Design a binder for this molecule. Structure first.
Ligand SMILES: Nc1ncnc2c1ncn2[C@@H]1O[C@H](COP(=O)(O)OP(=O)(O)OP(=O)(O)OP(=O)(O)OP(=O)(O)OC[C@H]2O[C@@H](n3cnc4c(N)ncnc43)[C@H](O)[C@@H]2O)[C@@H](O)[C@H]1O
Ligand SMILES: [Mg+2]
Ligand SMILES: [Zn+2]
Length: 216
């Protein structure tokens, strides 16, 4: 079960990915999360990626592909994986092809979580994240039972540094110009799957589960 999750900033990759990993146990591989984990620890990778991430721009291809290649090689990817936020440039997709060809692990589906760009600003500025677990909530659409704290572990919720109007706008701008080419790339490959991301969380996942049940 080799999957790729794509979508514009705030479309819900993390939210949906959380379900997939729960029902199938494949590693959730989010480049955004990997970069931020590096930033917190202050690794050389983190400091280099930080400059781009803080501005809402894409981190350069070479270093991004590099850390992904290493990750997909781990033992825990034996039964499949869930790539989140990678690739997000045609170059990255082409590179992933080579990488997976060497690993003998072809992509089963590239799942595009389609959400109108017009409602993504609201989704991001209203997002709050668990400082302990990473799971996300939304002040309006998916609020925590007790404001400011995670339902699961009681950890404090925070607002990502790049989740403000200006940076969100840049993020939408940057990724929108990469969107159609990626869709065309995988549409040609023959395994692009479009999912309506503008509905209730569990209803979005139902559409995702339909595809996954054919991958055991
Ligand atoms: N491959 C790569 N190459 C180069 N650079 C790279 C890179 N990968 C990463 N980077 C760098 O890293 C940065 C950050 O990457 P990344 O963290 O991957 O940024 P992203 O793509 O913008 O995605 P988000 O995490 O912001 O949102 P999401 O789709 O997971 O949404 P969520 O589920 O939280 O949901 C959002 C909100 O909506 C709510 N929500 C979820 N589902 C629904 C629903 N169905 N209805 C209503 N609300 C919902 C949630 O509760 C939440 O509040 C990039 O900008 C770039 O600089
Ligand atoms: Mg995410
Ligand atoms: Zn939590």
């Amino acid at each position: 079960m080799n999957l790729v999750l794509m979508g514009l900033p705030g479309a819900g990759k993390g939210t949906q990915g959380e379900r997939i990993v729960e029902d199938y146990g494949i590693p959730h591989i989010s480049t955004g999360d990997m970069f931020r984990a590096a930033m917190k620890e202050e690794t050389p990778l983190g400091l280099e990626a930080k400059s781009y991430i803080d501005k809402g721009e894409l981190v350069p291809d070479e270093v991004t592909i590099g850390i992904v290649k290493e990750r997909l090689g781990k033992d825990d990817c034996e039964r499949g994986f869930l790539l989140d936020g990678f690739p997000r440039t045609v170059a990255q997709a082409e590179a992933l092809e080579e990488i997976l060809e060497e690993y003998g692990k072809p992509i089963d589906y590239v799942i595009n979580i389609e959400v109108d760009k017009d409602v993504l600003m609201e989704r991001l500025t209203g997002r709050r994240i668990c400082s302990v677990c990473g799971t996300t909530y939304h002040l309006v659409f998916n609020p925590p039972k007790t404001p400011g704290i995670c339902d699961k572990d009681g950890g404090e919720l925070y607002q990502r540094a790049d989740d403000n109007e200006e940076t969100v706008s840049k993020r939408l701008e940057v990724n929108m110009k990469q969107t159609q080419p990626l869709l065309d790339f995988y549409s040609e490959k023959g395994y692009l799957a479009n999912v309506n991301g503008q509905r209730d969380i569990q209803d979005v996942y139902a559409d995702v589960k339909d595809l996954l049940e054919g991958l055991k």
